[PDB]
Design a protein around this motif. Sequence first.
Motif, mmCIF file in Angstrom:
data_model
loop_
_atom_site.group_PDB
_atom_site.id
_atom_site.type_symbol
_atom_site.label_atom_id
_atom_site.label_comp_id
_atom_site.label_asym_id
_atom_site.label_seq_id
_atom_site.Cartn_x
_atom_site.Cartn_y
_atom_site.Cartn_z
ATOM 1 N N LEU A 40 10.046 -6.976 -18.295
ATOM 2 C CA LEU A 40 10.683 -7.530 -19.491
ATOM 3 C C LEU A 40 11.914 -8.228 -19.027
ATOM 4 C CD1 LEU A 40 10.593 -4.475 -21.861
ATOM 5 C CD2 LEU A 40 8.941 -6.284 -21.615
ATOM 6 N N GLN A 41 12.551 -7.689 -17.971
ATOM 7 C CA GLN A 41 13.790 -8.338 -17.488
ATOM 8 C C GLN A 41 14.138 -8.021 -16.066
ATOM 9 O OE1 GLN A 41 17.388 -5.890 -17.863
ATOM 10 N NE2 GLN A 41 18.254 -7.604 -19.024
ATOM 11 N N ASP A 73 17.208 4.687 -17.846
ATOM 12 C CA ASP A 73 17.158 5.094 -19.249
ATOM 13 C C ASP A 73 15.711 4.840 -19.732
ATOM 14 O OD1 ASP A 73 19.787 6.058 -20.092
ATOM 15 O OD2 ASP A 73 20.249 4.285 -19.007
ATOM 16 N N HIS A 82 17.655 10.031 -19.840
ATOM 17 C CA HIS A 82 18.552 9.338 -18.944
ATOM 18 C C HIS A 82 18.715 10.119 -17.680
ATOM 19 C CE1 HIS A 82 22.324 7.275 -17.700
ATOM 20 N NE2 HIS A 82 22.651 8.476 -17.224
ATOM 21 N N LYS A 92 -0.588 -0.787 -26.674
ATOM 22 C CA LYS A 92 0.474 0.049 -27.180
ATOM 23 C C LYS A 92 1.467 0.224 -26.051
ATOM 24 C CE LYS A 92 2.237 4.272 -28.919
ATOM 25 N NZ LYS A 92 2.562 3.797 -30.313
ATOM 26 N N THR A 93 2.768 0.205 -26.463
ATOM 27 C CA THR A 93 3.808 0.460 -25.498
ATOM 28 C C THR A 93 3.992 1.987 -25.378
ATOM 29 O OG1 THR A 93 4.925 -1.601 -25.824
ATOM 30 C CG2 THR A 93 6.156 0.121 -24.731
ATOM 31 N N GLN A 111 2.199 -0.310 -20.848
ATOM 32 C CA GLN A 111 1.393 -0.384 -22.011
ATOM 33 C C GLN A 111 -0.030 -0.066 -21.720
ATOM 34 O OE1 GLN A 111 2.528 -4.330 -22.603
ATOM 35 N NE2 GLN A 111 3.772 -3.700 -24.436
ATOM 36 N N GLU A 163 12.467 5.242 -22.611
ATOM 37 C CA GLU A 163 12.067 5.502 -23.951
ATOM 38 C C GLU A 163 10.576 5.847 -23.890
ATOM 39 O OE1 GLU A 163 12.973 2.940 -27.110
ATOM 40 O OE2 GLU A 163 13.580 1.321 -25.808
ATOM 41 N N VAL A 164 10.172 6.897 -24.640
ATOM 42 C CA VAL A 164 8.766 7.322 -24.675
ATOM 43 C C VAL A 164 8.291 7.305 -26.128
ATOM 44 C CG1 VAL A 164 7.210 9.223 -24.233
ATOM 45 C CG2 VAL A 164 9.335 8.928 -22.818
ATOM 46 N N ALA A 165 7.288 6.509 -26.463
ATOM 47 C CA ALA A 165 6.853 6.422 -27.840
ATOM 48 C C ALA A 165 6.601 7.824 -28.326
ATOM 49 C CB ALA A 165 5.514 5.693 -27.843
ATOM 50 N N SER A 166 7.031 8.026 -29.566
ATOM 51 C CA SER A 166 6.897 9.362 -30.182
ATOM 52 C C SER A 166 5.483 9.811 -30.378
ATOM 53 C CB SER A 166 7.659 9.458 -31.501
ATOM 54 O OG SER A 166 7.034 8.645 -32.497
ATOM 55 N N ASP A 167 4.580 8.866 -30.544
ATOM 56 C CA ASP A 167 3.222 9.275 -30.793
ATOM 57 C C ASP A 167 2.393 9.364 -29.525
ATOM 58 O OD1 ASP A 167 3.611 6.458 -30.678
ATOM 59 O OD2 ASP A 167 1.769 6.109 -31.856
ATOM 60 N N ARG A 197 14.006 9.790 -25.722
ATOM 61 C CA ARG A 197 14.854 8.969 -24.866
ATOM 62 C C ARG A 197 15.428 9.861 -23.758
ATOM 63 N NH1 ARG A 197 14.298 7.795 -29.423
ATOM 64 N NH2 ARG A 197 15.798 9.350 -30.290
ATOM 65 N N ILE A 209 9.180 2.658 -21.915
ATOM 66 C CA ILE A 209 10.046 1.510 -21.552
ATOM 67 C C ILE A 209 11.082 2.102 -20.578
ATOM 68 C CG2 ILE A 209 11.835 -0.080 -22.238
ATOM 69 C CD1 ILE A 209 10.308 -0.391 -25.003
ATOM 70 N N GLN A 216 20.381 9.577 -13.361
ATOM 71 C CA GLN A 216 21.031 8.663 -12.444
ATOM 72 C C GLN A 216 21.052 9.296 -11.081
ATOM 73 O OE1 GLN A 216 24.609 8.523 -15.288
ATOM 74 N NE2 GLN A 216 25.664 9.212 -13.430
#
Lengths: 409, 1011
Positions: free
Chosen positions: A209-210, A255, A401, A233-234, A229, A257-261, A399, A237, A403
Amino acid sequence: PALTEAKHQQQFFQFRLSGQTIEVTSEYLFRHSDNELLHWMVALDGKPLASGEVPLDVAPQGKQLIELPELPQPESAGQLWLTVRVVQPNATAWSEAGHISAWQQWRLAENLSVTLPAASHAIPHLTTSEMDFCIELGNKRWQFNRQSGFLSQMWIGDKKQLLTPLRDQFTRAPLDNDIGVSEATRIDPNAWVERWKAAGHYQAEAALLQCTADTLADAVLITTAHAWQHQGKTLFISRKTYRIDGSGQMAITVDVEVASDTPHPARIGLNCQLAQVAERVNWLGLGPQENYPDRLTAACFDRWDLPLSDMYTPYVFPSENGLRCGTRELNYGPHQWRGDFQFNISRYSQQQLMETSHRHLLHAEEGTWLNIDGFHMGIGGDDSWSPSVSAEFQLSAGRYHYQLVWCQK
Amino acid sequence: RRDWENPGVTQLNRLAAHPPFASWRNSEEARTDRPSQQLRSLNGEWRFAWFPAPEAVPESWLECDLPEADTVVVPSNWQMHGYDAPIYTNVTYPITVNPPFVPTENPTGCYSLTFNVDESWLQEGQTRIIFDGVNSAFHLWCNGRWVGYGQDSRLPSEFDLSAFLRAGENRLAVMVLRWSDGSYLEDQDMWRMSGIFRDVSLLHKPTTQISDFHVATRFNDDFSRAVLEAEVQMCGELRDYLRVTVSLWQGETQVASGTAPFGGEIIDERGGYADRVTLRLNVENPKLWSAEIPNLYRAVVELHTADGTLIEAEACDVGFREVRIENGLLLLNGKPLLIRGVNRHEHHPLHGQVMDEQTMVQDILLMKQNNFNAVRCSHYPNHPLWYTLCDRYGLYVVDEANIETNGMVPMNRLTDDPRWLPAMSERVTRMVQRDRNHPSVIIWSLGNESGHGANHDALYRWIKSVDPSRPVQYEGGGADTTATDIICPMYARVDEDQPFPAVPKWSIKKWLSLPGETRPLILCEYAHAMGNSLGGFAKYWQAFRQYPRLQGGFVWDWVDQSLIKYDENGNPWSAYGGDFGDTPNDRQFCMNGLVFADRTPHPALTEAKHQQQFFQFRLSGQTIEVTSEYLFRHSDNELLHWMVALDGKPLASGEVPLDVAPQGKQLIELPELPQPESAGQLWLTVRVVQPNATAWSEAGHISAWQQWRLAENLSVTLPAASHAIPHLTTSEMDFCIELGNKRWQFNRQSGFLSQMWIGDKKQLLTPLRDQFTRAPLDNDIGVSEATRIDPNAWVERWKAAGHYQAEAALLQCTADTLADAVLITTAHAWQHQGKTLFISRKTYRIDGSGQMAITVDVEVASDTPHPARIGLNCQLAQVAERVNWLGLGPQENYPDRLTAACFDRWDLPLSDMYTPYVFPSENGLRCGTRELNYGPHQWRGDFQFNISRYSQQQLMETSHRHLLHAEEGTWLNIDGFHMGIGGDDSWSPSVSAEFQLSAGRYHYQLVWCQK
Ligand SMILES: [Mg+2]
Ligand SMILES: [Mg+2]
Ligand SMILES: [Mg+2]
Ligand SMILES: [Mg+2]
Ligand SMILES: [Mg+2]
Ligand code: NA
Ligand code: NA
Ligand code: NA
Ligand code: NA
Ligand code: NA
Ligand code: NA
């Protein structure tokens, strides 16, 4: 490795700490502690500061108070840890002299470091090309591929340190408990492994994505974002920064993110295949044996050092194995990783372990596979035919995190 | 004699106790519960004079009114009229402990009334006076002649005035003592008041009359058949022609009747009770009473001659129900109850302890509307109408004797003393004699916090002999003593044991299985609702549903005991302990309610409502499984409303009638749903709505709800590029960044964002700084006092560690210009006397879009006490009318008290974002928030926040809500993490470990932008 967890939970002496006071309670119903002595040791981040021994003299079901002596201040940042062990000085019909029958640890004072590092002797340089962002510092080089968005190579001099790029990893080679009774011929869709398969966790691919590079006053900063994906479905991230400074340390912030479903993933970490192989593994964390989030009580926080093969557990049916949790520092070859993570390190990829049904058929791959996890799912075991990992050990926060600092030693 | 300093004299000339009488002379009026011309009220205007001691009352007062007397309303508590101060003491007695003596300075209330008596009442029969509540002891004179004496502030004292009255005008004189030996049994945790605070009435009964009657209902195995047995006793002229007829009515239909002459069965060698008779009526398929369906019949008890003359009739509402404990379970009509109870004191902020119909009704409606089904009379018999109301509206009641000696040392000093057996006996026996025919009463209690004495054992047994229809419970002495049929602890936790010596409070789950234990366990008090509390409430409800023998409990408590005081300007304000000069006192410990003294709810009420739901839900794919927890009713007034929204944006919704039998299940398959391509989280919310009004609720009342996350589409969408790059300007003291009409200023000496401009308007009054503390909650303070610090309390641990006074030391502050942004990086250390408590490292990235992304990573020393919160705060310049957020709400909600909150887009007036707890503390937080909008600002992330006109410092420094003053601008507290609030009790740390911020390292991130 489970045996040691059993030994610890089944100890016959319980302990509590209050100040300088340690209270030992006997769980024996009939004998006095007539073949036992309490050994204590205080260490700062693995470095021994003081210790002693006191004879135990507790009646069955009774208590004994032990006052620790004044604990001299420590000259340095770090967490002091107290460890106690019950040792039987004399041999018995079932144990040798020196047998350790029980242990416990506690954190004592901690002094956080507030000491500003020191102005880098140099400033890393960023070289930008169509396909890569390279950073050079002294005789070290890092290469970030612009299409993949990962650190794909790192050199010490002219020596490459990676065999595979450093990439996020959300799955593990399934344990017996993850599999349960599921079978290729008769899938148990309720099993963890089947939930993960079905959701595409093992097949999901990183989509960039970046991928940006910036230079700061004393460092170069790489920023990346990827989506994993499956069937449109994602699933996850992952956003990161890699900050390389004048000191040569690479600070990695992750960091996720994990889809809730989606089914809660087996782990949230990074992995890579190191080009080199080294004789020992040295870490400051829980050990010395393999330990998992829901099976780490028996492990102790200290500085451990073992031959690399001790870092692999030869379960007959291979799977994810050899993790150590609660690790603040890991050393392997000239590399050092610092943070608060869980890790496993071996000659076998998760891929191989999951594709191999008997340990005798595994073969050491080139280099060393390192899995370093910000978080790892519990292993469960209440039974091995239905999901048994407790909610509190499932990666359901949504979510996450973590390091890490990777630097040379 | 000083009868009030003698526990051996608890009354003189007082009549026997009995159930409510009215002496109707017409059976249909009795059947209809219409007023009786034979029962008059003497409530109204009386004359009153206050004296500092009984020795100061002048003798003339017996014969005539004192010119200096005032006219006042009765019933009343004289403290409410300002004659002297009410005292708020909790455990310590308000008087010196020196039984059975009281202070020689003992406030005496001289009440009098001149009233009329018609000659007809005096031509025949008996005329008695009845004082429903006189606190604490009193002497009675009629027309200057001494009549009698009474003790026990909470039950009726009746005297026969037949021989003292005369046709026409008559004058009563009542000398009420504030303190008496009865006070040693009246140490409940409430305001200490006095006076004639319950009704006063005059009852005419015939010479040959019904002196008592008891109604029992026994059933066959499936409750399809019952026998109503009514034992009736008479006093007076016993003759062969007398008869008793008991008839039972269901509405205007007579379902059963029996007539018999007097003379009960032979009971012993001397015969039987010739003055008693027992009628037995068979009733088929009786309509059963429960709190769910308070079905009632009317029994009319007629005393009459056999040839047809009704002498008099008495009557009561009857509820056919059986209460019994079997196999370790409390069953009602054969089914195991789940008590959703609350303790309720009789308290009114203006009238003190005087109760009125309106108020009682108001409380019963709200209790029911909030899914309570039971109430405990903490800690004394209630005003008589309460029972009528719980019988009719349907609430299970624990009726409790007026015996509390908490302040004794040890607590059973009096209750184990045989010389106090007689005084205690009366409190138990007269209660049972008065309230035994009310179906709402299902359990009798021996009193409260009086330790465990042999007197309790004796009395437990007395009740069990006299009234086998109801279990007896009593918590003193460890809650599982031989004086209780139910393990009824106060404040025992769900999983955590509290092994105090002698009277440990075991985890409730472990308590049930201690070797040899088999009784059911129902907490007589739990979830201490003092101030911002009810943290952990859900943990109790999960255990109760999971363990059969865990049958519920009674929350402490319903309503704050605050009293209204008036300021110079004459504006009312809520007062607590010590606000009347009263000392010693227990300050705000009198406010522990789910509702404020005026019945306004505290936020905890909605948490109780939710956890106490009567329908449980499970979701599987699109199938919703509804399970009913009702035991006896079908869901005949309920429909299920469902709605799906994408981050607050409504997508689809529907309704489905609910048809579940008691304990049944219903599956409801939802429609194919929206699977939008657009980013966000889909949320399903279901609510149970009662379409029709009831006796206790309005049409459309919502009785239950629940939510689930459905599919989530994470955003992978890249924001377009900005036709702009922010510019940085530096000086030794600051880093200034400008982007369009926006500007940010970071102070290089402090390391904080000191100002921001939108347009050219300043946006901050105080800089944005980290915050690790909160204005302490009542549960953070517990019993700690300046005068007597409790070092184990959270507030004290934070104080001693220096959290409230730690100063930020700057460790680093740099600025860098990126491709399309300016990045500021800071690090600060908070120290105390050399100890580094917390370290805050952040980055602020301001981009060409004008957004400011803030990343914060905090380290907390493992050896400092876990901090109250980990967040940022600032005083905004702006004051805006509304607050709009996407997150949990709409009411205040905390980590351990947020189950009731629903995730949605909420929008409220600023003022609603503050909870006016009487004793101010951190309040108004909303958790799980993803976006917050206030004025021109918008903050996005995953945080908890509060926003109001009052700083944390102000809240911590002010003791009463009416003294708070709105500050300039608005204070915003935005937390990455916030500690639970606790509440299992309010006098020891009660925040569960999983709600303590002990992770050591914490990470949070926010984006602050405009719009
Ligand atoms: Mg007395
Ligand atoms: Mg008739
Ligand atoms: Mg006459
Ligand atoms: Mg008390
Ligand atoms: Mg006090
Ligand atoms: Na020993
Ligand atoms: Na395998
Ligand atoms: Na239960
Ligand atoms: Na209280
Ligand atoms: Na219905
Ligand atoms: Na305050």
